[PDB]
Amino acid sequence: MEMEKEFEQIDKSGSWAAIYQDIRHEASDFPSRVAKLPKNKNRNRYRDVSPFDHSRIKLHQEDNDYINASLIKMEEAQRSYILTQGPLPNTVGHFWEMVWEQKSRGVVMLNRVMEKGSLKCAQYWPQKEEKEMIFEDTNLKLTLISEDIKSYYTVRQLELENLTTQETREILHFHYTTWPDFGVPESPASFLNFLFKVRESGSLSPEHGPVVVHCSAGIGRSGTFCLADTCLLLMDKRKDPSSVDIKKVLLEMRKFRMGLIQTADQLRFSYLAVIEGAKFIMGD
Ligand SMILES: O=C(O)c1csc(-c2cccs2)n1
Ligand SMILES: O=C(O)c1csc(-c2cccs2)n1
Ligand SMILES: O=C(O)c1csc(-c2cccs2)n1
Structure with a gap:
């Protein structure tokens, strides 16, 4: 069926929960063995959300290459996305290592650091120009260059420096700040x-x-x-x-x-x- 009229047909029939459960039943199941190794327990925010082995992003590191992140490659549309959890206190350095190694230009953040009175991710970028961040485990430096605060979102310009090679890159941070604590936007x-x-x-x-x-x-x-x-x-x-x-x-x-x-x-x-x-x- 078309989309807009399939939409009105599900609204009038009140069957969104049944449509959604069908999707859950048909969805793929692939192994996530690396995510579940004991050495990676403090690299996962939620025990029931793990990257599949076949599509996980690997860090370029011989000790432990694991991060909770997946490559979504859409062949007909010719678009790719990396989807990842909010960084944890012990994975902020891994997060920026991934950004660097995958040559990403932008980071899209759809949550607030605190929601519903609890921490939903680490404060992983600097809030003042003169107070830069150094990630010693992965040898990166991150500086806030500028910040533009709008009513529904904030855009930041960041500089990421690989301290090993002294190369630098400009990263754009797109922060959607108004998704409600409960439910979805009206x-x-x-x-x-x-x-x-x-x-x-x-x-x-x-x-x-x-x-x-x-x-x-x-x-x-x-x-x-x-x-x-x-x-x-x-x-x-x-x-x-x-x-x-x-x-x-x-x-x-x-x-x-x-x-x-x-x-x-x-x-x-x-x-x-x-x-x-x-x-x-x-x-x-
Ligand atoms: O099936 C539709 O209503 C639909 C979805 S996008 C679209 C377009 C028409 C003309 C250009 S794009 N039509
Ligand atoms: O809407 C079309 O023109 C259409 C339907 S399927 C399709 C393709 C799938 C894969 C490559 S093109 N195009
Ligand atoms: O929540 C944390 O632990 C946190 C946020 S930024 C950060 C670091 C910056 C530079 C080195 S560690 N740690």
């Missing part, structure tokens, strides 16, 4: 505006490594971001945009990381975002 307008700002920066383009996107576990909000982006790109590429099947795209992405889209409300929100976004693209 309108997708600010989330789509944010997605378009990431796109306009070059951070999603083939001349760079894959964008790094995270929330707390790296599957829920993060899954919503890449699902909406890929569906909208396919609608622009194909002769028949109404052939884009969001459920089929989601199952393809779940071949590369488990659990993408965590609730039926997140599924409904993803449909809403793609539907509204397709009107603004045109040719709109």
Whole structure:
């Protein structure tokens, strides 16, 4: 079926939970043996969220190459994404090592450091220009260059220096700051505006490594971001945009990381975002 009318049909029939459970039943199951080794317990935020072995990002290190991060490679759309958990106190250096080694231009953060009164990720970037961060375990230096605070999101320019080689690179940090503590946003307008700002920066383009996107576990909000982006790109590429099947795209992405889209409300929100976004693209 088309998307917008499939949407009204699920709303009128109140069957979002059944649609979402079908996706969960059909989703791929691949091994995640490296994630479960005892030496990696303090590298995982949640015991039930792990990268598959076949798609995990490897650190270029001979001691321990493990990070909780997955490469989502979308062949028809010609887009790749790295989805990862929010960094932990003992993985902030690994996080920036990955950014460097994978040649990423942008980092997309969809959570706040504290939500619901608890810590959801480490404070892994500097908050003042004159107070830079040094990660001694991976030999990197990170400096805040500038910060632009808007009503729904903040963009930061960061400098990452490989202290071994003295090479430097500019990284863009896109921080969506207004996702509610519970549920999903009422309108997708600010989330789509944010997605378009990431796109306009070059951070999603083939001349760079894959964008790094995270929330707390790296599957829920993060899954919503890449699902909406890929569906909208396919609608622009194909002769028949109404052939884009969001459920089929989601199952393809779940071949590369488990659990993408965590609730039926997140599924409904993803449909809403793609539907509204397709009107603004045109040719709109
Ligand atoms: O939460 C933490 O532990 C944390 C946040 S930034 C950081 C480091 C910066 C530079 C070296 S360690 N640690
Ligand atoms: O909508 C089209 O034009 C369409 C439907 S499927 C499709 C392709 C799949 C893989 C490569 S092109 N294009
Ligand atoms: O099937 C639809 O309603 C749909 C989704 S995107 C699309 C486009 C039309 C013209 C350009 S893109 N139509």
